[model samples]
Target: MNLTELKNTPVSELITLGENMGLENLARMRKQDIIFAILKQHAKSGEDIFGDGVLEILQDGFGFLRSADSSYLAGPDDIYVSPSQIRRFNLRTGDTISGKIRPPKEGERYFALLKVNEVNFDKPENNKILFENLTPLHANSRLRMGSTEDLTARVLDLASPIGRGQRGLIVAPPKAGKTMLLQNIAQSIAYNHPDCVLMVLLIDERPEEVTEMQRLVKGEVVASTFDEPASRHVQVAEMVIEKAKRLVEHKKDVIILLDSITRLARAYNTVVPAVLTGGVDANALHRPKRFFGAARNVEEGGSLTIIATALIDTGSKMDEVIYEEFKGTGNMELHLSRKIAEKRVFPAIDYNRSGTRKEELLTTQEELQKMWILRKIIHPMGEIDAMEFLINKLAMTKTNDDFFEMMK
Candidate 1:
C-alpha cells in the first residue's frame, strides 16, 4: 500500500494485515506497536513517515516548520528553540529548515516543531519576546528626552523640547520637509539611545517610504497607505502602543513616531455619521483624542513618547479636527514655516511658534537661566539679525570668559 493509504489505515486493520501477511507475532502486539511497525515499513520502503518543511521564524526565536507547499503548520508540540539554540545555529530570517512531526501529548494548540533541522530572520534589535501586559498612562508621571547631537534635536531640546510621554506635533505647510525632519529625529534616537526602543507607524503609502525607513530606523514598523481605512491606522497605532507600554514596564524607554498623524485624524473624520444610540457616537474629535492620549508615562517608571506630524494649509489654518486634537494634548509643538526655510535654516522650526510646556520642569535652573538670556536677546529680532547678534557677541571677547560660555 502507498504511504498515504497506510497512514489512514486503522490499527486493527493494520494488525490484521500483519497477521495475514504471515507475521503472526503482530496479532499479539499492542495497537501503538502495530502502528509503529506500519510506519517503520513505510520508512524502510523509502517513503518518509515524518513530515518535513521549511522553517519560518517569528519575532520570538521559536518558528514554525511549514510543508513545502506551505499547506500545513508544525504541530503546536514542536519548536521550542532557546536563545542558546538560536545563537549556536546562527539562524537568521531566511533559511531552509526541515523537521519531523509527531502527535501532541496534551494541552497543545497546533502541531509542534521537532528536531529543527534548519534556517534563516528587528524590532528590539534581536529582542523577540513580546510583552502582553500594558499599563495605561496618566499625566502624573514624567517623560524625559535624553541628550542628542543632532542640530534639530538640540533645537527641539531648547525650543520645542519633547519628553517621554509627550505628545508632540511637527506641524508644517507643504514642502516644509516634515517627513525628513521626522526621520532625522527618529534616526537620532536610534543612534543616541541604544537603550530605548523605537516603533515607527507608517500610515502613508509609497513603498519607497517603507524601503528607506527599513534601512535607517532600527525599530518595529506598522506600514500602510492613505487608501486604507482610517480605522486601520488607528488600530495599528493602538497595537504598537500596547507593545510599547509593555516594553516600558520592563524599564526600557519607548519612542513611537508617526510619519504624520494628520492622515490618521482625517481617517477618523472621513465618514462621520451621527449616532444617538446608547453607545458613544462616532465623534471625530473623541476618536483622535483617544489615539493621541495613548502617549503618556506609566507609573511603572517606563515612558512612551509619541511624535506625530501634521500638515497645514499655507493659510496657517489646520483642519478643525486635527487642530483640536493637538491643541492641548502635546507637551510641545514645533511649527515649521516656509519663510524660515528660504533663509537657509536647516530645520526651519519657528522659535516663537514652537515652545515646550514640561521643559521648564525638566531642565536645571542654570540651563533655564541660560535659555532665558538667549530667548530675550533673540526673540524679537529677524532670523538673520539673531544669528548675527550671537556671532558678534561670541566673537567680542567678554571680560568674563564664562559670561556667554554658559549659552553653549
Candidate 2:
C-alpha cells in the first residue's frame, strides 16, 4: 500500500497486483488510507501495487524516503527526507518531504524550512569501490541475431556490464517486438556466453512466440499462457524466479525474460481471464495460477533482468500513454522509457520521444550523460535545473556529431 514497503521491490513486481489496485506511485500520496484507496481504484486496470508486505507501509505512513532521518544508503536522497521538518516550501535539494504540517513537537506551528537547519536522516557510509562494483549498469550494447536496433542490446549490455546480481524491467508497449527481442537475447547468450545460464519463461504468449522460445531458450525456459485472467506472464516470471535461484546458486549466469510481465501479473492479480466471462466473484484471486517468474526467487537476489511488455490496451492504435502494447502481431513485448530522476536526458529508452520513431535513439556512454540530460531537462527532479549543466556535459561526453545524429 505504501511505498516504503514496496521500496525494495523491482518495478516489474510493482506492476503485479499492486499496480492494479492503483498502488504504482502511492509513495507520493499523503496517507496510509490513500494506500488502500488505490487498490480499489485500479481493481481492473491491471496495475500491480497491492501485494504482500503492503499494509505495514500504509500503517506507518512510511514512504519511499521512509523518514527524513532514516537514510537508506542504497537509494537516493529521497530516502533521507522522512525525518526532516518542512520550514520551506520549494526544495532546492533533491528531496520530497511529506507529512502533517504542524505537531506538538514544533509548538503546533507550520513547518518553516528557514527554522529547522539540521536534518537527522540516516546517512549510510559510502564505499566508492563497493558501490561501483555492485551497482547495475543499464548501458549501451548491440545485438545481432536480428535487427541491430533491438532492446536486447541493453539486455546483453546489462548482462555483461551489470553482470550477475541485479534486477530491472524490460517494459514496452505491445507489438514493440518484445518476444523477438527476448528470443534473440536468450539465443545470443546461449551461444555466446556458453558458461552463461538463462530462463525465457513465457507468459500468455502466442503459439509462435512460445514455440520459438522453446527452440532457442527452452533449455531453461518455462513457457505458458493458458489465457486465464490475471494471466500467465507473472506466473511464468514466478516460475523463472523459482528455478533461477537454483541456477544462480549453481554459479550459472542466469537471465530471466518475461514475454509480457505486465500481462502475466495482471492475469492472476484480478479477474481470472476465463472466469471474467462467466462472472466469477469479481474481487477474488484466480484458481491461483501460482507465481512462476524468476522474480519470486532468482531475480530478487539481484541476479536477473526482468523484461515485461505492458500493452496499453491500445498502444498500436493510439500512442497516447507513450508505451502501450501492439496487439495481434508477431511482436511479443514493448518497453517504456522509465525516465530517470532529471529532465536532462529526455528519456532513458529513446531520448527523442519528442520526435518521430527512427533509428537514432540509443547511446553508448560510460557515465550516463544522456540519461542525466533526460532527468534534468525533459523531467527534472525537485527544483534542480540540471538541464544546461548536462547539455555542456553532452558536448564533452560524445566524441563527435556521429554520436549525436545516432539518436537524432
Say which candidate scores most in TM-score: 1
Flag regions of model 2 displaced more than 4 Å.
Answer: 1-163, 227-238, 270-302, 314-349, 352-408
Using lDDT as the measure, the top candidate is 1
**lDDT per residue (tens digit) for residues 1-408 in model 1:** 332344336657875665454454764765435544544444444443344333445675665443322112233323333345456564542233444444434664334534543232112132232233344433433333222325455556657656656777778776777767767777767666767777777765567776686567666555766566656666555456555654555566778888667666665555455542222234655666766676666555667678787767734233533664476667668887777676675567666657776566665555677677667767787654444444344444432242455565
Native-to-model Cα distance after best TM-score fit, residue 137 in candidate 2, in Å: 11
What's the residue-level lDDT of 352 in candidate 2?
26
lDDT scores of the candidates, listed in order: 0.56, 0.36
Q: Residue 376 in model 2: shift from native, Å?
A: 8.7
Cα lDDT of model 2 by residue, 281-343, tens digit: 233332222221222213222343444444444433222222222222111222334233234
Among all windows of ten consecutive residues in candidate 2, which has the lowest summed lDDT?
50-59
Off by over 4 Å in 1: 1-149, 271-282, 314-320, 382-408
What is the Å distance of residue 260 in model 1 from its true position?
Answer: 1.7
